[PDB]
Amino acid sequence: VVGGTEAQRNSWPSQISLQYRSGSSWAHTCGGTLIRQNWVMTAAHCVDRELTFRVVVGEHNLNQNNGTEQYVGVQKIVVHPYWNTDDVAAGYDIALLRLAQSVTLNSYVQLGVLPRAGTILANNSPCYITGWGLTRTNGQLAQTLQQAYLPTVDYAICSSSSYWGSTVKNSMVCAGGDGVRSGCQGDSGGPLHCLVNGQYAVHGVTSFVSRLGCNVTRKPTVFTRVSAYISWINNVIASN
Ligand SMILES: [Ca+2]
């Protein structure tokens, strides 16, 4: 997250860290959202490669023991059937991970709330992005969870020639673009929490940013619109 600030520890209990084994150690690669005691929602491009993955819940400081973590393996990766790695702008950047075991829900570990199917947010709605991704374009990962206010930019405006144009589809959600705050590599797969009816729900899964950089004016961070995949998600969890 570029231009953010440290989140109060465990204030976003559904946020998880997706790591892969590198030799004899692990490395944070993406964010994700715990939607079931044994299911995690993330980006398809995060699990595109055949590596060994593990999920960490109740995490805050990646380099220290906060005494609130739980580490569990991934036994099943279900990528959306239409996902095309060579055409991220085509959408479908979403995947579900069945955990090897069920996490225990407590003060630091809670399920994320999903919006109803087809829900579209009004322009400039209040949302927050969270993650351990780069704090600057070509910078380095943050070691403690970061958060930044990232209001939405509706489709009409986001798909215009002044912003993303044809790169963005209606199955996506845009937020930010103020040139100061934004998601960045390492935030991918993570959540976009938006305030609706008094509660925060996960409306997006971080997908991509501009090739020019993370925080670029009029180039909002692009997220997979969760409300467009509700049926798919349920059909997967119901039969797995
Ligand atoms: Ca820790």
CSV table of C-alpha atoms and ligand atoms in Angstrom, one decimal:
chain,number,residue,atom,x,y,z
A,1,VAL,CA,0.0,0.0,0.0
A,2,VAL,CA,1.4,3.4,-1.1
A,3,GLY,CA,0.6,6.4,1.0
A,4,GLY,CA,-1.0,4.5,3.9
A,5,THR,CA,-0.6,4.2,7.6
A,6,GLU,CA,-0.2,1.2,10.0
A,7,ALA,CA,-3.5,-0.4,10.9
A,8,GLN,CA,-4.4,-1.0,14.5
A,9,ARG,CA,-3.4,-4.6,15.1
A,10,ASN,CA,-6.0,-7.1,14.2
A,11,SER,CA,-8.5,-4.3,13.2
A,12,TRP,CA,-9.1,-6.1,9.9
A,13,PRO,CA,-9.4,-9.8,11.1
A,14,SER,CA,-10.4,-11.3,7.8
A,15,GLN,CA,-7.2,-10.2,6.1
A,16,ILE,CA,-4.8,-13.1,5.5
A,17,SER,CA,-1.2,-13.4,4.2
A,18,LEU,CA,-0.5,-15.7,1.3
A,19,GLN,CA,3.0,-17.0,1.3
A,20,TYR,CA,5.0,-19.6,-0.8
A,21,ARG,CA,7.9,-21.7,0.2
A,22,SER,CA,11.2,-20.5,-1.2
A,23,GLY,CA,13.9,-23.1,-0.5
A,24,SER,CA,13.6,-23.5,3.3
A,25,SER,CA,11.7,-20.3,4.1
A,26,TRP,CA,8.4,-18.5,3.3
A,27,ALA,CA,7.8,-15.3,1.5
A,28,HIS,CA,4.7,-13.1,1.5
A,29,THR,CA,3.4,-12.8,-2.0
A,30,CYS,CA,-0.3,-11.8,-1.8
A,31,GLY,CA,-3.2,-10.8,0.4
A,32,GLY,CA,-6.5,-12.6,0.7
A,33,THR,CA,-9.8,-12.7,2.5
A,34,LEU,CA,-11.0,-15.5,4.9
A,35,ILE,CA,-14.6,-16.3,3.9
A,36,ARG,CA,-15.0,-19.6,5.7
A,37,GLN,CA,-13.1,-21.3,8.4
A,38,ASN,CA,-11.5,-23.3,5.6
A,39,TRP,CA,-11.9,-21.1,2.5
A,40,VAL,CA,-9.8,-18.2,1.4
A,41,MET,CA,-10.6,-15.8,-1.5
A,42,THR,CA,-7.8,-14.3,-3.4
A,43,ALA,CA,-6.5,-13.3,-6.9
A,44,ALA,CA,-6.1,-15.9,-9.6
A,45,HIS,CA,-2.8,-14.4,-10.6
A,46,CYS,CA,-1.4,-15.1,-7.1
A,47,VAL,CA,-1.8,-18.8,-7.5
A,48,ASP,CA,-0.9,-19.0,-11.2
A,49,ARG,CA,2.4,-20.6,-10.4
A,50,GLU,CA,2.9,-24.2,-9.1
A,51,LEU,CA,4.5,-23.4,-5.8
A,52,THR,CA,3.8,-24.6,-2.2
A,53,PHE,CA,1.5,-22.1,-0.5
A,54,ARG,CA,0.5,-21.5,3.1
A,55,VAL,CA,-2.0,-19.0,4.7
A,56,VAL,CA,-1.3,-17.0,7.8
A,57,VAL,CA,-4.3,-15.6,9.7
A,58,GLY,CA,-4.3,-13.1,12.7
A,59,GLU,CA,-1.1,-11.6,11.3
A,60,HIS,CA,0.2,-8.1,11.9
A,61,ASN,CA,3.9,-7.9,11.9
A,62,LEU,CA,5.3,-10.2,9.2
A,63,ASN,CA,8.8,-10.4,10.8
A,64,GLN,CA,7.7,-10.9,14.4
A,65,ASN,CA,5.6,-13.1,16.6
A,66,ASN,CA,2.5,-11.1,17.5
A,67,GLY,CA,1.1,-14.1,19.5
A,68,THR,CA,-2.1,-14.0,17.4
A,69,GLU,CA,-1.1,-15.9,14.3
A,70,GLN,CA,-2.3,-19.3,12.9
A,71,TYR,CA,-0.5,-21.0,10.0
A,72,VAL,CA,-2.2,-23.5,7.8
A,73,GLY,CA,-1.6,-25.2,4.4
A,74,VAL,CA,-3.6,-25.1,1.2
A,75,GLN,CA,-5.0,-28.4,-0.2
A,76,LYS,CA,-7.0,-27.2,-3.1
A,77,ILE,CA,-6.8,-24.2,-5.5
A,78,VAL,CA,-9.9,-23.4,-7.6
A,79,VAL,CA,-9.2,-20.7,-10.2
A,80,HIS,CA,-12.0,-19.2,-12.2
A,81,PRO,CA,-12.4,-21.3,-15.4
A,82,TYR,CA,-12.1,-18.3,-17.7
A,83,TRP,CA,-9.0,-16.7,-16.1
A,84,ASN,CA,-6.4,-15.9,-18.7
A,85,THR,CA,-2.9,-15.1,-17.4
A,86,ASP,CA,-2.0,-13.3,-20.6
A,87,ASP,CA,-5.0,-11.1,-20.5
A,88,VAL,CA,-5.5,-9.7,-17.0
A,89,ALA,CA,-7.6,-6.8,-18.4
A,90,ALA,CA,-10.1,-9.5,-19.5
A,91,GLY,CA,-11.0,-10.0,-15.8
A,92,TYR,CA,-11.8,-13.2,-14.0
A,93,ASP,CA,-8.9,-12.6,-11.7
A,94,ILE,CA,-10.2,-14.6,-8.7
A,95,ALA,CA,-9.5,-17.9,-7.0
A,96,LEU,CA,-10.6,-19.9,-3.9
A,97,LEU,CA,-8.3,-21.8,-1.7
A,98,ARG,CA,-9.6,-24.7,0.4
A,99,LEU,CA,-7.4,-24.8,3.5
A,100,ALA,CA,-5.9,-28.0,4.7
A,101,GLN,CA,-7.6,-27.4,8.0
A,102,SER,CA,-10.2,-25.1,9.7
A,103,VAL,CA,-8.9,-22.0,11.4
A,104,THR,CA,-10.2,-21.2,14.9
A,105,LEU,CA,-12.2,-18.0,14.9
A,106,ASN,CA,-11.4,-15.6,17.7
A,107,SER,CA,-10.7,-11.9,18.5
A,108,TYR,CA,-8.0,-11.8,15.8
A,109,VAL,CA,-9.5,-14.2,13.3
A,110,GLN,CA,-12.9,-13.5,11.7
A,111,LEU,CA,-14.7,-14.1,8.5
A,112,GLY,CA,-15.1,-11.4,5.9
A,113,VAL,CA,-18.5,-10.1,4.8
A,114,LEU,CA,-19.5,-10.4,1.1
A,115,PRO,CA,-21.9,-8.1,-0.6
A,116,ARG,CA,-25.1,-9.3,-2.2
A,117,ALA,CA,-24.9,-10.4,-5.9
A,118,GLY,CA,-24.9,-7.5,-8.4
A,119,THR,CA,-24.3,-4.8,-5.8
A,120,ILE,CA,-22.8,-1.7,-7.5
A,121,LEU,CA,-21.3,1.1,-5.3
A,122,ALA,CA,-22.0,4.7,-5.9
A,123,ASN,CA,-19.2,6.9,-7.1
A,124,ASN,CA,-16.8,8.0,-4.5
A,125,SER,CA,-18.0,5.5,-1.8
A,126,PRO,CA,-15.8,5.1,1.3
A,127,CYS,CA,-13.6,2.1,1.1
A,128,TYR,CA,-10.2,1.1,2.6
A,129,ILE,CA,-7.5,-1.0,1.1
A,130,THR,CA,-5.3,-3.1,3.3
A,131,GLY,CA,-2.1,-5.1,2.7
A,132,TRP,CA,1.6,-5.7,3.2
A,133,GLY,CA,2.5,-4.7,-0.3
A,134,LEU,CA,5.2,-2.2,-1.5
A,135,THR,CA,5.0,1.2,0.2
A,136,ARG,CA,6.4,2.9,-3.0
A,137,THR,CA,6.6,2.0,-6.7
A,138,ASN,CA,9.6,-0.4,-6.9
A,139,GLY,CA,10.0,-0.1,-3.2
A,140,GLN,CA,9.8,-2.9,-0.6
A,141,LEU,CA,7.1,-4.7,1.4
A,142,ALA,CA,5.7,-3.2,4.6
A,143,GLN,CA,6.4,-5.4,7.6
A,144,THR,CA,3.3,-4.3,9.5
A,145,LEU,CA,-0.2,-4.2,8.0
A,146,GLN,CA,-0.9,-1.0,6.2
A,147,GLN,CA,-4.3,0.7,5.4
A,148,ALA,CA,-5.3,3.6,3.2
A,149,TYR,CA,-8.6,5.4,2.5
A,150,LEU,CA,-9.4,4.6,-1.1
A,151,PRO,CA,-12.9,5.9,-2.3
A,152,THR,CA,-14.4,4.4,-5.4
A,153,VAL,CA,-14.5,5.7,-9.0
A,154,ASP,CA,-17.6,4.4,-10.7
A,155,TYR,CA,-17.4,2.5,-14.0
A,156,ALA,CA,-18.6,5.4,-16.2
A,157,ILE,CA,-15.7,7.5,-15.0
A,158,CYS,CA,-13.1,4.8,-14.7
A,159,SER,CA,-13.8,3.4,-18.2
A,160,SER,CA,-13.6,6.9,-19.9
A,161,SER,CA,-10.6,8.1,-21.9
A,162,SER,CA,-9.5,10.2,-18.9
A,163,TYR,CA,-8.8,7.2,-16.7
A,164,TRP,CA,-8.4,3.5,-17.7
A,165,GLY,CA,-10.6,3.4,-20.9
A,166,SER,CA,-11.1,0.0,-22.4
A,167,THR,CA,-8.7,-1.6,-20.0
A,168,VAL,CA,-11.4,-1.7,-17.3
A,169,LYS,CA,-14.5,-3.9,-17.6
A,170,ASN,CA,-17.8,-3.7,-15.7
A,171,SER,CA,-16.8,-6.8,-13.8
A,172,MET,CA,-14.2,-4.6,-12.0
A,173,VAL,CA,-14.2,-1.9,-9.4
A,174,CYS,CA,-11.9,1.1,-9.4
A,175,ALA,CA,-10.8,3.0,-6.3
A,176,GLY,CA,-8.4,5.9,-5.7
A,177,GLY,CA,-6.3,7.6,-8.3
A,178,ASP,CA,-5.4,10.7,-6.3
A,179,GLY,CA,-1.8,10.2,-7.2
A,180,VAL,CA,-0.9,9.7,-3.5
A,181,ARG,CA,-2.5,6.6,-2.2
A,182,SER,CA,-2.9,3.2,-3.9
A,183,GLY,CA,-2.4,-0.6,-3.8
A,184,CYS,CA,1.0,-1.9,-5.0
A,185,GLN,CA,2.6,-5.3,-5.8
A,186,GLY,CA,2.2,-7.6,-2.8
A,187,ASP,CA,-1.4,-6.3,-2.1
A,188,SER,CA,-2.7,-8.4,-4.9
A,189,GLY,CA,-5.5,-10.8,-3.9
A,190,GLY,CA,-6.2,-8.6,-0.9
A,191,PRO,CA,-9.5,-7.0,0.1
A,192,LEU,CA,-11.2,-3.6,-0.5
A,193,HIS,CA,-13.4,-3.0,2.5
A,194,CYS,CA,-16.3,-0.7,1.8
A,195,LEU,CA,-18.8,0.8,4.3
A,196,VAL,CA,-22.4,-0.2,3.5
A,197,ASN,CA,-25.3,0.1,5.9
A,198,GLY,CA,-23.1,0.5,8.9
A,199,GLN,CA,-20.8,-2.4,8.2
A,200,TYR,CA,-17.7,-3.1,6.1
A,201,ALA,CA,-18.0,-5.7,3.3
A,202,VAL,CA,-15.4,-6.9,0.9
A,203,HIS,CA,-16.3,-5.5,-2.5
A,204,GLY,CA,-13.0,-6.1,-4.3
A,205,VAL,CA,-10.0,-8.3,-4.7
A,206,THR,CA,-6.9,-6.3,-5.7
A,207,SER,CA,-6.0,-7.1,-9.3
A,208,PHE,CA,-3.7,-4.6,-11.0
A,209,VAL,CA,-2.3,-1.1,-11.2
A,210,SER,CA,-0.7,0.9,-14.0
A,211,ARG,CA,2.6,-0.2,-15.6
A,212,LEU,CA,3.8,3.3,-15.0
A,213,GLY,CA,3.6,2.8,-11.3
A,214,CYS,CA,1.4,2.1,-8.3
A,215,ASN,CA,0.2,5.6,-7.4
A,216,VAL,CA,-0.5,7.4,-10.6
A,217,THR,CA,-3.0,10.2,-11.0
A,218,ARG,CA,-6.2,9.1,-12.8
A,219,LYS,CA,-5.0,5.5,-12.8
A,220,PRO,CA,-7.0,4.0,-9.9
A,221,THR,CA,-6.2,0.6,-8.5
A,222,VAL,CA,-8.3,-2.0,-10.2
A,223,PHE,CA,-10.1,-4.7,-8.2
A,224,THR,CA,-12.1,-7.8,-9.2
A,225,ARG,CA,-15.8,-6.9,-8.4
A,226,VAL,CA,-16.8,-9.6,-5.8
A,227,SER,CA,-20.5,-9.0,-6.2
A,228,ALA,CA,-20.3,-10.3,-9.7
A,229,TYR,CA,-19.0,-13.6,-8.6
A,230,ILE,CA,-21.3,-14.5,-5.7
A,231,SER,CA,-23.0,-17.4,-7.5
A,232,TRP,CA,-19.7,-18.9,-8.7
A,233,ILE,CA,-18.2,-18.7,-5.2
A,234,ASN,CA,-21.2,-20.4,-3.6
A,235,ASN,CA,-21.4,-23.2,-6.2
A,236,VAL,CA,-17.7,-23.9,-5.4
A,237,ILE,CA,-18.0,-23.9,-1.6
A,238,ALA,CA,-21.2,-25.9,-1.7
A,239,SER,CA,-19.6,-28.7,-3.7
A,240,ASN,CA,-16.2,-28.8,-1.9
B,1,CA,CA,3.7,-11.9,13.1
